[PDB]
Design a protein around this ligand. Structure first.
Ligand SMILES: Cc1cc2nc3c(=O)[nH]c(=O)nc-3n(C[C@H](O)[C@H](O)[C@H](O)COP(=O)(O)OP(=O)(O)OC[C@H]3O[C@@H](n4cnc5c(N)ncnc54)[C@H](O)[C@@H]3O)c2cc1C
Ligand SMILES: Cc1cc2nc3c(=O)[nH]c(=O)nc-3n(C[C@H](O)[C@H](O)[C@H](O)COP(=O)(O)OP(=O)(O)OC[C@H]3O[C@@H](n4cnc5c(N)ncnc54)[C@H](O)[C@@H]3O)c2cc1C
Ligand SMILES: [Cl-]
Ligand SMILES: [Cl-]
Ligand SMILES: [Cl-]
Ligand SMILES: [Cl-]
Ligand code: NA
Ligand code: NA
Lengths: 487, 490
């Protein structure tokens, strides 16, 4: 048995931040537990968390790889000549370079533990034995061989989320994003199930790397992909995915999946339609990872959705037990889990309580082309503010009339409280959107108004400068109703 | 008819500034406006045309050409992500680039053309504008004041918006050299080229010629002092030098051409002041741009010039003559299109809108489209350090993740924030690497709202991006205390 000031269950974004800050800013004794030290099967997430191993970082590399499909084709407009028939996308080379890059980060975090005093790493499955004891076991079976027992005065739960699998017959024929990262070969025909950013991002990855005669289909059970994003943007990205050869099946949901004699999958939709594919990747949701923690042993309370319930400072119902990051089922983003972990350790080991602000958080979707957003979409703004204005600009950038990708419209929309000009949200679609939106998140912390954008001098020629050129609302919401003139 | 025409405002120069002023005077305030320019569409002999330098031989076509040049990196970098193709078959077709560019520019030319037909009170006159007197602009067939008169335009107010022009140094064999204007029209990409100058135009062109050079080629950039891009962040100056070298560009600093002659094969033989020599197919001089005031006949009305040669103006763009104003590059200040545009809008609001307004020339964001590019806004540290007793510099430099796989590990991203350490106010932000021009725009908005470093640091990052580094810097890398560089406060 071993003592500590902080035991962190889960060496991911939120937990490495919390642990690192405690060991180094406040010189506490920290233990951190995870099930695996390097990425991949069988447990996928590992030292560094979801982001590093099966998340933001490898997805970004693979989206970057998929973008060359457009680049190679678009180069001809600017005079570039080569043998187009010689072009092939080697997925194994992609995956191998991606794995090497992720493994470098893994080795780097191992070195971080070996080099930082008062921060120890424990390999295996952690769970709550009592209010101040964490057990680590050989496997996730609450019953396997104990490896270590750790008493702790404070306990941080930061075990993240896991893909949700619907309970349809044949679900075990489907993969999740976890397995997608390791596919031996690029699927020829693939169905991504879901309308959110993971389904959209992988559909473009697979679309770029599919072999000759490939097809990517994305299905979603409701009418329009990317619920929660700007409505013009959802429509436009739908249109740009279609122009790049992806087939979008809206109002469709798998009812079952079966095995074909050749090893491919036979998907039957609730509507009766059928599709044969090599891979069915479910990306319908991620759920808080709470099962393995034996939370009953101490009474830590859950919300009706399955998140560990927390107050604004991340405290559970049981004193000295905390929860940050995806396990709380709030904003599922890496930097938000990091900010929670830092605010928590500031509150508990330093002294200036700090709470994470969950409004006006900027985020991105690495679709092709990508989306960058911060703050409210207009239909949510229309329910809290009596007068809302929407400034909108949309057009194909001149580089994309030369490249031949004419379908590539840039969209910039600014939503305001029309009573005092306060910017409430900014929504972007087009090359560079994720990069443009970062400093827009700072603007929103400063309560920028539309006149602060419009009075700023443009950087020319950029897409971003569009945000500084809008003076006149394209339309309004008054008391929740959409209209073109103010009444 | 054979009678002069009358206007509230005559603008000489239909470019960035003049078109903004004219359009706004006509459409917002119902003035009667004339705009004069020398050519309706781009290209020789006069290069700039309706739409200005920006549209014809500046921002717009250079960005299309830098975008074309970036495919050289994209093609190469694709291999690290598993793209395979016949490398040996790769050609850069400069003539296709130039054709595509001319066609895009000409489309813009044509759309300005129809704006004039349907805008009531906004008229275009072709030829050369000069001041005959306080209320009469004469338009002539050429820049020579003896050339024939095409029109006389009566004007209550006159706006000088004639922009700037490349400067040519008076060295022997200067006639064998070209400027950026000709560079846009060269029939063939040069095998060997010297770009003379260390400013943005020389650097951006070096990148473009480097991508499109034929098989045995070489781009050399020379600069008379010791480090390119004066006026920019010093770290970024040194790093951009390294990245350009890494891409096969030869940077010769502390070198200056003394003379140029023709070898017997027709190539250019450049001798430097050091006595070093270089043979090239093209010498592009880009040592500076000067205000275009010579053709205006300013002596006729007594408009004063600064020592530097620009039209002297007050904060409201007024000259020493009551109803004659000047904006844009002719005033030899900040030579940027959106600055000319903002000056034009402010001037018109002031004169005809009764809502006085002056352009703010501080904290203007701007970009260099070098490969890799720069985005910058506000003070560089050594300027800040002369004005503020305590200055903190936050600095981060990293290889973005993609370049761990691409092959281009030399592509370091640099992000610097310079602050007044007494109260945390951001004084300057300086960025080098892919996306920097796009990231920096909203930074301009932050600086105009007096952001502090903690406004940055408390903002949650968008992950994974390069921009998020701006919102993860909490501890100075170093300081200046009463002008003195030091890694810690005393
Ligand atoms: C495909 C995909 C793409 C994504 N892209 C982005 C993006 O672009 N930008 C963004 O901001 N966010 C992105 N995310 C979300 C981001 O990955 C998460 O929000 C983030 O990782 C949450 O961090 P966390 O600390 O809550 O959990 P995690 O980082 O998931 O860490 C949990 C850790 O706990 C370990 N663990 C679980 N149970 C136990 C146990 N009982 N004992 C010991 N260890 C355990 C796991 O092995 C894991 O390493 C993406 C997610 C996915 C799935
Ligand atoms: C190569 C290059 C690249 C550039 N890149 C950028 C960039 O990326 N971003 C940026 O912001 N700025 C850029 N600039 C600068 C930008 O082009 C100028 O700051 C801007 O055009 C200034 O606008 P203006 O209205 O002062 O003058 P202009 O746009 O130059 O307009 C002046 C007009 O007056 C006309 N004219 C001149 N004399 C007369 C006369 N006597 N009678 C009638 N008409 C006349 C000319 O034909 C011209 O059309 C670049 C410039 C160059 C040369
Ligand atoms: Cl769905
Ligand atoms: Cl819907
Ligand atoms: Cl060619
Ligand atoms: Cl020089
Ligand atoms: Na350690
Ligand atoms: Na931050």
């Amino acid at each position: 048995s071993k003592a500590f000031d902080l035991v962190v269950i889960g060496a991911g974004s939120g937990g490495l931040e919390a642990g690192w800050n405690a060991a180094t800013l406040y010189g506490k004794r920290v233990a951190v537990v995870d099930v695996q030290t390097s990425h991949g099967p069988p447990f996928y997430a590992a030292l560094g968390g979801t982001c590093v191993n099966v998340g933001c970082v490898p997805k970004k590399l693979m989206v970057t790889g998929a973008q060359y499909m457009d680049h190679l084709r678009e180069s001809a407009g600017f005079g570039w000549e080569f043998d187009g028939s010689s072009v092939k996308a080697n997925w194994k080379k992609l995956i191998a370079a991606k794995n090497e890059a992720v493994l470098d980060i893994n080795k780097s975090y191992e070195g971080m533990f070996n080099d930082t005093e008062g921060l120890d790493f424990f390999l295996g499955w952690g769970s709550l034995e009592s209010k101040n004891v964490v057990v680590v076991r050989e496997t996730a079976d609450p019953k396997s061989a104990v490896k270590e027992r750790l008493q702790a005065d404070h306990i941080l739960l930061a075990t993240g989320s896991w893909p949700q699998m619907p309970a349809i017959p044949g679900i075990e024929h489907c993969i999740s994003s976890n397995e997608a990262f390791y596919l031996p070969e690029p699927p020829r025909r693939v169905l991504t199930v879901g309308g959110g950013f993971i389904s959209v991002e992988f559909a473009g990855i697979f679309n770029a790397y599919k072999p000759p005669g490939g097809k990517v289909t994305l299905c979603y059970r409701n009418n329009l992909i990317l619920r929660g994003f700007d409505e013009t943007i959802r429509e436009e990205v739908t249109k740009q995915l279609t122009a790049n050869g992806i087939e979008i099946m809206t109002n469709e949901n798998p009812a079952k999946v079966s095995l074909n004699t050749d090893g491919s999958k036979h998907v039957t939709f609730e509507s009766g339609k059928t599709l044969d594919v090599d891979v069915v990747m479910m990306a319908i949701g991620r759920i808080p990872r709470t099962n393995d923690l034996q939370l009953g042993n101490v009474g830590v309370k859950l919300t009706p959705k399955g998140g560990v319930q927390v107050d604004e400072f991340s405290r559970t119902n049981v004193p000295n037990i905390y929860a940050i990051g995806d396990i709380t089922d709030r904003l599922m983003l890496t930097p938000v889990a990091i900010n929670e972990g830092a605010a928590l350790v500031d509150t508990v080991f330093g002294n200036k309580p700090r709470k994470t602000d969950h409004t006006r958080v900027a985020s991105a979707v690495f679709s092709i082309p990508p989306i960058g957003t911060c703050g409210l979409i207009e239909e949510v703004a229309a329910k809290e503010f009596e007068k809302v204005a929407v400034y909108m600009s949309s057009f194909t950038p001149l580089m994309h009339n030369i490249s031949g990708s004419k379908y590539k419209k840039f969209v910039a929309k600014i939503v305001t409280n029309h009573s005092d000009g306060t910017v409430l949200g900014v929504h972007l679609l087009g090359d560079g959107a994720p990069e443009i939106i970062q400093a827009v998140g700072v603007c929103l912390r400063l309560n920028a108004k539309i006149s602060d954008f419009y009075n700023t001098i443009g950087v020319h020629p950029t897409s971003a400068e569009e945000l500084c050129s809008m003076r006149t609302p394209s339309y309004y919401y008054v008391k929740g109703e959409k209209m073109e003139k103010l009444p």
